[PDB]
Amino acid sequence: PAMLPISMSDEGDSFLVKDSLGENKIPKNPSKVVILDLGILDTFDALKLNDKVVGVPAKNLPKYLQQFKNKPSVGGVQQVDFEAINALKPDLIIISGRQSKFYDKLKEIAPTLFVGLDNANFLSSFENNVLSVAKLYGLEKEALEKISDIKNEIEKAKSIVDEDKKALIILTNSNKISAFGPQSRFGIIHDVLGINAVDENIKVGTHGKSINSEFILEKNPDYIFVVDRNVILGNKERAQGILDNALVAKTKAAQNKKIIYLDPEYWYLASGNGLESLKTMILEIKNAVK
Ligand SMILES: O=C(NCCCCCCCCNC(=O)c1cccc(O)c1O)c1cccc(O)c1O
Ligand SMILES: [Fe+3]
């Protein structure tokens, strides 16, 4: 079933808000927001809300968000510094799926809004997250224009896609490989941009289905989209070395130089959950397959 969305009613100087984790009273125009979703951080920047941001997970701050490098840190996306959050005295904390498990602890500190994406309904959830944040600040007009521009980009990207080619999405960690299909955390490649999948039913898991290079060759993708989690975790291994092997070399993707190394900060950290990231990621795909 679809994830429950964020819903809100206007309460004068505040909103009454419900999402899939719970209910909150959120002040209008919140002044001190701790943001633990990197995509939503980029939406705050797109909406010119940088001064509302009181703290960010500096351990995982992407290259494309370095304008937030002066903000107080609240740790990393997987290493949340609850003391730092408390010390910032936020009026609102914004989380996604990585921090759901700490919901009760965060809500003790301040109202806690969940903005995770629904992998089965990416665009609907994406719009709900953007427009909910925009509603808090009265920025619906600006947000809607930016969403309309993204939808136009989606159409332009779709128009260049080759109906007869198929792709596989993989993730590398350590010297290991895992795979992702349609309606996964990386599913927009298939679900929104219409690139065909080599396998419609790849076993779901947060960090993917363990596979070997024999599987890659068996599926013989035209494109391989690679997300190197090693870069995010600080491990020394790299995808370019893992995939330089005799099995992968026999794929159409290798033979046509269509092993595409996706920017892991966008794909794995932001997850396309921002006005900036999603636009940039659509272009990244388009330019890789045109
Ligand atoms: O809830 C999540 N992960 C919890 C994992 C807890 C146990 C393993 C922790 C050590 C391994 N993970 C990392 O060291 C890591 C570091 C930065 C960002 C990540 O996403 C990471 O998994 C999670 C949710 C959505 C997307 C993700 O991807 C996640 O993980
Ligand atoms: Fe993770």
**What are the sequence ranges of the domains in the chain?**
1-160+263-290, 161-262
Question: Could you tell me if the CB of 233 is within 6 A of ligand 1?
Answer: yes
**Radius of gyration of the chain from Cα atoms?**
19
For residue 12, the CA-to-ligand 2 centroid distance in Å is: 39
Question: Could you tell me if the CB of 79 is within 6 A of ligand 1?
Answer: no
23 is in an annotated binding site: no
268 is in an annotated binding site: yes
What are the distances in angstroms from CA 110 to CA 87, 102, 263? 11, 13, 33
CATH code of the domain made up of 1-160+263-290: 3.40.50.1980
Contacts 24+ apart (CB under 8 A), 96-103: 96/36, 96/37, 96/39, 96/40, 96/271, 96/273, 98/36, 99/36, 100/21, 103/21, 103/22
For residue 77, the CA-to-ligand 2 centroid distance in Å is: 9
The whole-angstrom separation of Cα 50 and Cα 100 is 24
**Amino acid present at 148:** S
Q: Which CATH architecture has domain 161-262?
A: 3-Layer(aba) Sandwich (3.40)
Question: Could you tell me if the CB of 174 is within 6 A of ligand 1?
Answer: no
For residue 61, the CA-to-ligand 1 centroid distance in Å is: 15
The whole-angstrom separation of Cα 224 and Cα 288 is 11
1-160+263-290 and 161-262, same CATH topology: yes
Ligand in closest contact with the CA of 270: 1
What are the distances in angstroms from CA 243 to CA 12, 54, 92, 214, 221? 56, 41, 43, 11, 14
Atom of ligand 1 nearest to the CA of 268: 28
Paired tokens of 230 = 């090693």
Ramachandran area for residue 286 (φ above 0: left; ψ -120 to 50: alpha; else beta): alpha
13 is in an annotated binding site: no
Question: Could you tell me if the CB of 229 is within 6 A of ligand 1?
Answer: no
Among 96, 98, 102, 273, say which to mutate for ligand 1: greatest number of ligand atoms within 8 Å of CB: 98
Ligand in closest contact with the CA of 98: 1
